[PDB]
Structure 1
Amino acid sequence: GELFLVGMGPGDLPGLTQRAREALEGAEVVIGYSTYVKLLEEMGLLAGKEVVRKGMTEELDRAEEALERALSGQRVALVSGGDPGIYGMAAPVLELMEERGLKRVDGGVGLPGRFAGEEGEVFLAVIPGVTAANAVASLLGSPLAHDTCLISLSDLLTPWPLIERRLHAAGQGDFVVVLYNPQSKRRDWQLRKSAEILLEYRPKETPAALVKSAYRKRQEVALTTLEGLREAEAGMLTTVVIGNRQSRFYEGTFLTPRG
């Protein structure tokens, strides 16, 4: 069958690419974490299709469900907010296929591609989407106009010491920093820690911003400084952006020099 990993962008109907719309239109079943599925349902894009959201809390379960359905011949659309390849479903799906020993049967490289196994075969494709970094950047100004690093503060499957390594490196390289999964009830110290690490490489007054629910209901853009992040409150719907040693504010906009 087919397994299309559909990146839906920041969350609003106009935010999806036509390629994403078409992938959803041609899908028989749609799988994804509850929040994404509901957004699509609200848009009226899931009408007359099988929708799986129950028991789809875990990433591994979503991937296994989508893969097994695809292998059984179904036309599946597995949705990820933003882009599937950025802290999304692309990795879990490929790692699962790898674990099951599915082999490529079309001689191609990269994706899309046809893979097969004793269970059956699957045509896998990834539909790219506007990732959080660019989506929030468009609501800020030109914060990512130069070299940038994308870092997730989720230490669920990644040891914190490795994340600190990533942060120190971003600091020394003078990279604009975009923090994905900046904070949660459990993970309430990671953001502050990240700010303290970067503060060893750039000024306290360095531009920073917290953009919540970009392109969605209750969207919020909060401008602050790197020092301000030490006490800032972020959520799972927030993306944080930290400027480099050249970033500055310009009439309400977050400007990172192109040169």
Structure 2
Amino acid sequence: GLVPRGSHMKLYIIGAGPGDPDLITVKGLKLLQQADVVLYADSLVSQDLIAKSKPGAEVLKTAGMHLEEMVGTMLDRMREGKMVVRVHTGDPAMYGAIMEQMVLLKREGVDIEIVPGVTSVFAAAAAAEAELTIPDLTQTVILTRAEGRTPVPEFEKLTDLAKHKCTIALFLSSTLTKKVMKEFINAGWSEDTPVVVVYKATWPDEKIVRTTVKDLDDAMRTNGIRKQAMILAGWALDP
């Protein structure tokens, strides 16, 4: 491009997708292939996607890094004229923890561009061959998380949310299935209501488990699923 526009002062926040390297958007892949600096969280974002960055890119893992340092590193590379990008699992809007870095960067005059991606809810619906909305059955899909030690807001408890009897998709809840069950049975759900668990959707080790509220905790333990699972609950998951 011919003329300087201060385009290094930008962060691209790219929705990698659920894990298969080909479920990134075409646009996210173009940016990932041009970036000079690639930030991401190990074993959640596939290594085969991150290896698509160009020879010479600086690839940084952010897990063991505090907020101000990560941000300070991003700005240093930006101010050296580098194209900097941060790759997030699924779509960043769902528990991507992007707001804190955005607020600090915009105060330093950085532009943000978020590139939307395939969220794991939808990757799991697809793998399960389910549409989450069924005319005359349910027209609402509730994205949430079960409460473990970190409480959820007062008006968002799983039981209250489950009184709507629609489709419920649980993030960050694979080791909270006893709590999920209790919450569903206290809302009045049948213990036979369908629950589909998709562990690592789209990865080579994906597992699809079909079960019900009553066997949820046993199907989790029996199948060894203790992380990275998307739980789809409702009559739209009836096979």
Q: How much does 1:165 deviate?
A: 3.7
Distance 2:115 2:161 in 1: 29
Q: 1:238 and 2:224 equivalent?
A: no
Deviations 1:76-118 (A, max 9, x none): 1101011111111422323x42xxxx6xxxxxxxxxxxx453x
Match of 1:134?
122
Match of 2:180?
194
Match of 2:168?
177
Distance 1:61 1:154 in 2: 28
| Superposed CA RMSD | 2.6
> One-letter code of the match for 1:170?
L
> What pairs up with 1:83-98 in 2 under 5 angstroms?
83-94=91-102, 96-97=103-104
The structure that is strand-richer by fraction is 1
Q: 1:148 and 2:141 equivalent?
A: yes
In the alignment of these two chains, the number of paired residues is 219
- Given that 2:78 and 2:84 are in contact with CA atoms closer than 8 Å, whether structure 1 keeps it comes out as no
Q: With structure 2 as the length reference, what TM-score do the two structures score?
A: 0.80
Distance 2:72 2:203 in 1: 28
Q: How much does 1:175 deviate?
A: 2.5
Query: Unmatched 5+ residue regions in structure 1?
Result: 103-114, 251-259
Q: 1:159 and 2:146 equivalent?
A: no
Q: Which runs of 4+ in 1 moved over 6 A?
A: none
**Aligned CA distance change for structure 1 residues 37 and 216 (closer, same or farther; 3 Å):** closer
1:74 to 82, 95, 104: 82
Distance 1:238 1:65 in 2: 33
Q: 1:203 and 2:210 equivalent?
A: no
After TM superposition, the structure 1 stretch with the greater mean CA deviation from structure 2, 206-215 or 28-37, is 28-37
2:13 to 5, 8, 15: 5
Q: 1:56 and 2:56 equivalent?
A: no
Distance 2:56 2:151 in 1: 43
- Given that 1:178 and 1:242 are in contact with CA atoms closer than 8 Å, whether structure 2 keeps it comes out as yes
Sequence identity percentage: 21
Q: How much does 1:66 deviate?
A: 5.9
Distance 1:77 1:116 in 2: 18
Match of 2:236?
247
Match of 1:256?
none
Deviations 1:158-181 (A, max 9, x none): 425x37843122211112111111
Q: With structure 1 as the length reference, what TM-score do the two structures score?
A: 0.74
Query: Unmatched 5+ residue regions in structure 2?
Result: 1-8, 134-138
> One-letter code of the match for 1:11?
G
Deviations 1:16-57 (A, max 9, x none): 111111221231100011122624234x3353311001x534
- Given that 1:153 and 1:163 are in contact with CA atoms closer than 8 Å, whether structure 2 keeps it comes out as no
